[PDB]
Amino acid sequence: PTTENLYFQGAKRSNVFAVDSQIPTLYMPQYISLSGVMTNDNQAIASFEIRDQYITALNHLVLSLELPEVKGMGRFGYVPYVGYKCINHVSISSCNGVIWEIEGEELYNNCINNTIALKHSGYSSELNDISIGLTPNDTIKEPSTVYVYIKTPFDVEDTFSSLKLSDSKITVTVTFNPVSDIVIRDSSFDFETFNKEFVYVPELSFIGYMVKNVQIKPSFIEKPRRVIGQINQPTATVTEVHAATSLSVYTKPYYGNTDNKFISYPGYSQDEKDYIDAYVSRLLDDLVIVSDGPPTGYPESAEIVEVPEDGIVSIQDADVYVKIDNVPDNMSVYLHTNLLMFGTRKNSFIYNISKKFSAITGTYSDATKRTIFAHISHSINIIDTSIPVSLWTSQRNVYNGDNRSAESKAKDLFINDPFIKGIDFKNKTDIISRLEVRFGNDVLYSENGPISRIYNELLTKSNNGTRTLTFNFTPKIFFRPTTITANVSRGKDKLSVRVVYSTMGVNHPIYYVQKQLVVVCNDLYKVSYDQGVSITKIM
Amino acid sequence: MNIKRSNVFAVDSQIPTLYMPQYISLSGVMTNDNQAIASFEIRDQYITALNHLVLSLELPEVKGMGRFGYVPYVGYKCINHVSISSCNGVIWEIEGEELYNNCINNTIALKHSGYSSELNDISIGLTPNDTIKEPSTVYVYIKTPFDVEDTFSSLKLSDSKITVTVTFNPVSDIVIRDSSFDFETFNKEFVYVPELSFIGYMVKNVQIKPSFIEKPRRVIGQINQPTATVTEVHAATSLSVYTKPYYGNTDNKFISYPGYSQDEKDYIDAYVSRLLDDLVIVSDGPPTGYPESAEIVEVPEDGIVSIQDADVYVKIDNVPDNMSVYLHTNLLMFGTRKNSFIYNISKKFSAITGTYSDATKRTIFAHISHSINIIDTSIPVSLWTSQRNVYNGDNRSAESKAKDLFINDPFIKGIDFKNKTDIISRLEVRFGNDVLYSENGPISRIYNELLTKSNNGTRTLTFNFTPKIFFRPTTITANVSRGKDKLSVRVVYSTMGVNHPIYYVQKQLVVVCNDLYKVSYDQGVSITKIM
Amino acid sequence: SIKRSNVFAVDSQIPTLYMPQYISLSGVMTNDNQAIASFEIRDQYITALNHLVLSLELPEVKGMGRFGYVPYVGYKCINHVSISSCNGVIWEIEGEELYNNCINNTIALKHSGYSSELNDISIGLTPNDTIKEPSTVYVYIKTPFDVEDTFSSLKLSDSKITVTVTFNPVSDIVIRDSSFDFETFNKEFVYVPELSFIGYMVKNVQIKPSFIEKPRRVIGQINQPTATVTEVHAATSLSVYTKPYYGNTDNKFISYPGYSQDEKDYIDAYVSRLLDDLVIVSDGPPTGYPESAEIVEVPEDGIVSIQDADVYVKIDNVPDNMSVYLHTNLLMFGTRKNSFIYNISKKFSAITGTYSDATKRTIFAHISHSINIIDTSIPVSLWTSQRNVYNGDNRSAESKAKDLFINDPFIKGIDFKNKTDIISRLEVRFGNDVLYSENGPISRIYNELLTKSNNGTRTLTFNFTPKIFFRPTTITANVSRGKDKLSVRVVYSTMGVNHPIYYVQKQLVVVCNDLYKVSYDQGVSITKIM
């Protein structure tokens, strides 16, 4: 009935129950906020000068942005993580030059695993859903403040890693992307006026440290260097590589051959399913039509077929089951059999979006004169939602391409997000089949599968990683970083990247998305404090 | 395959202090303002050190009629105060809200405390013998400074009796219920059944050293007063400032509650759903059962009903020929003066679509286009029918009013259930007469959230960026001669107009200060304030 | 005046000179005819290694029938992993323990195969139709060498390291209906593995002795509430959990949610599978159901009474020539004719919907029910078992044909989510002495908090000392006093004989982590030439 209740029935040394509480350097932290100086030398540049006899060291840079009230007519929304997308380049410099600098996309890539930093930058239904303005005085977006955590190497080990000011003046320079990049809008929205009236209103905050009798020592800093290859060039080279801690490789789409218009956008909801659902919903109004006689308002190239008694409409080998309840006696159910279609020859394989549907059910509403769709069985993927509208009507297409109504075409959105990777909005599709990295003429690393991305994701505990070669497994700040080292005499002083892209059919519109290869190299530098703060490249 | 150096591929495996851990569970002693207090005495010649306190709570079976559910994270909400003391006095103590604030970034601890559809959805009892809630056990992780560096930070018992005292909040605070639920009986029959668990360490030849502890001190400002002061500040590691609503001027009743689903959208959807039954009515002639002050207008053929400048589009399918569609144009209305601004909830709707069901004699709503916000869902029912209001205010059916819920959660912040609305426009902190810190925007909250990796932080000034346990914490230090020995906080509140019911939600300013103490083990365990 | 430690600067220590490399190797396949992959690691430049990742090429699946992979397919493929040298095994693990060790690692679980593409149950309509496209999954083989990166890495002291992976039969990793030609799939399926690791080329490595925790598993007898781990001398931890045993069944279940794995998803998938047979809109009494079925016409008030249980059924747009019917005994179980009856139809209180004239189907709107996770976890075999006095399964032949074979090897408890805690009391003895006892799972709570996991097990941790840098703290044996074994005794929760889940057989699982010393033997040896 009862049981024995006894404790620990299984029982030069280092003390694990006590430690000597070390007295630290005497200091005082302070959250300091500064207004900048705006310049259009006509790209927007904000400059922040930090010069104080009491600020001995600093870290944890946060940039505030006052987003204005948006008024007028049309559809408008901000890209997710708007604050990060605003950033083109961040530079930290002293009297001796640049101490540390980064491209906007690399800063974003460095913070992509930090949920809190991403939320602060602007990720909400209020900002990211596509809002509509009905009158010229209607408020589309209310004023808002976003916060961008400018992650720097000075944050790694808090005070130990902090940037020390050796009686030197520090300047933080932020270069901004055009407002076109951070905004999703329809043609109805007056962007011309918005672009003229929009001003970047920034404020820089940092944690400053007032230190008594600071004992400065030399340190090491990893400075990222980005190299972008030519359009559709599967190579890129990083020259003068002497001491690198890591190398990252990824693809970016190039939409210069398009008007940057897309059929749909999910808004705040960013899952793969949300992108697909938003796209399906945009097509359904033109796909299944309840009309009195053949539907009007569609191009002559459109092939709208009346749905038979059994509900099955055949588009070649593809069968589409369409069944709508409460259809008026004077009306019939019609299926648009070629809503979007692409073909390079008149008798080639045809990519038809209408063939990607297998079952469509719903109920017609007499009160609203609309079909309310219940269940949709389809094979629409993330690539479909990522096809620019221009690619459906490119010269390579022998067909009209876009057989949608003028109403649907007017609802198309301009998406100019500067940090898109791969060939889709989610970077789901891996389009690199093979990766080869050369240090000089010698093959340093090669792979036929994304094992370097698997390791990057595993080691960094992230789900949005890249093909990365890490040379440094040594703890940061407390140790001098381990690096791949050059041999100038043998010609091993450069990193050459070569990729082999995955293949596709010529009759798929996404085949024509132009790609650029991006190579990121982290070079090791020495931080010295002789005559103010200065950095020296390790060679 | 394709200079003095520190070894990074090998280490000398140090032999640690000889010890044995044990998970120890203890029943307490219950005491009763008649507030429930549980006392747990820890003393054993073999328990040398302890940490990782976990309090278990046996939630009973809930039977009877009416609507009932538990607040999310029920276990944390149960806690009013936790005290850890020896023969020499309090070693460490915390207010229930501060413990919860300290664990808010720990998903596992929050889940263990009681966060499930079984506990947090509002269940209904149909008969006096019907089970509303099944019995359940919740676990509250009592985070203490002794957990930071595991064995290194652990509380050492120097042959002294350690007492863990847990003060409980009244059961009213942890429960969400309607008027039909017999709370009077539940409150009389409810007993807190706690059990304290901890990781005990039997240590052979322990070498105790002096240490430091940060003890939180809380100051609550006078109701609606935008100032609070913390006296005798000599060595503080941090200072936190936040606002709480005070519902003493109300019956603590709210129209809706989302249950287990806790997103901002879930709160809004639950509210919209509760209003829709009285908002759009399919009736044979003018609808009955509504107050005289109700302005229920028949929807015209174009579907548009105008409430001043606001147009509401109403379209219901399958409406019987003998019936018509009606719109309640003043479901909830507020104004301090007649022929002036009106806060009308019916005006917060732009489009309502649905289909009438002949089988259930109800409208099944399809799509709703509205501007209902989190503040609307956070308005107590009492503020709609208050004396300040020139209107009747609550023009809902008796059926809807009967579905209202009592919400007494003790850890609500700001003026809404999600703490979404920032009501602090300016914060000023003074150390003596000198301005230590001032801000407009909540940059101190942004830093708190970044540095503590939490999405629900507070306006916090951190003075200590030194690693804990291994170093003596960095503090803001007093100057008694210069009068710099107190922290004075002044806030400037942003306001929603006087014709907004939420203006009448009273505010409490909360100031939390972490004072540094020395921990010595000379004749028992004792703490000394650093001065 | 006071001596202060510098918190604004540090002396950047120069580390051991090394170079890392991601190395991938193909194995050697062997064939109880269980698949075994062997990977030999021997190099003059590879000094140390860690972070083992196994790749698996999943083939294209063609044909007819319903087919899907279990969530985290890659981990479920693994029966056993062994890392050995010329001196024997260095470290080894059972597949379930590897999975249990990685269950708190979201990234590793995602890489192993967790997607709608893999885990939703796909349907093949023609013998040439593609059910699943080819895919590659990655299994992170977590080892003690990963804890402190380079410091913890496996040092291969001029020896040949062999990584041996034993695979589970493909039946375990696949969910399929009767229509799916499993016989052919099983014959044609081949495990195609590749091992990757992070290798380190180290200049002048200074190897030191270390410690390793090796997991050991003991599975108790079917339905026995006891298990014993013998020869326990230095253990760092002990875990206790339960596994169901489905040997007495055909491993068939009514429903499966696919990729969506929440408790609600399992319940919703089950409710959806039953609704077509539960509420029927028919012209006269419904046909195609067994004679034992009691399908009652729904009255004007909408209330149908099944003993004390009232079911409210209201369907809109029902044709005038048709009526609404309720299957009052869809699934029923009882051991004695006049005793308790477990009836799934009684677990419903309200069903609303609208009949579709276009598709000749009822589209259900709102369902008020008390269906739980246990209901979704009942094998179909128990409803039609010999113990049952009733027919049991009164569903249509259409519904019965949609049943799925689920053979996942890592199921714990008595339900798919391991939600039901069937252990009322736990007692652990070290020899004759009670080492630990608990009623509620406070040891699971501590495991979940300390390891930051939401799917922990009742675990007793003896080591709170930092790993690698310190020799682990252990529970130590006393052979003379008989304290050299860990005996686990549980008190199982009591369930009703008229409840089908009562007949799900249970096995008690006990995991022990034994401490081992890792040494590097160097010496001169002579051999006579022969």
Ligand SMILES: CO[C@H]1/C=C/O[C@@]2(C)Oc3c(C)c(O)c4c(O)c(cc(O)c4c3[C@H]2O)NC(=O)/C(C)=C\C=C\[C@H](C)[C@H](O)[C@@H](C)[C@@H](O)[C@@H](C)[C@H](OC(C)=O)[C@@H]1C
């Ligand atoms: C489990 O790891 C332990 C290994 C012990 O083994 C030993 C034998 O090997 C190391 C290794 C490989 C290191 O590089 C250490 C290092 O960086 C130190 C301090 C140590 O003690 C280190 C130790 C040894 O003691 N640095 C410093 O002197 C400076 C300039 C700053 C320190 C700041 C704070 C105090 C820490 O950051 C602290 C929050 C915590 O991280 C450590 C104290 C940690 O202890 C614990 C319990 O976590 C160590 C690293």
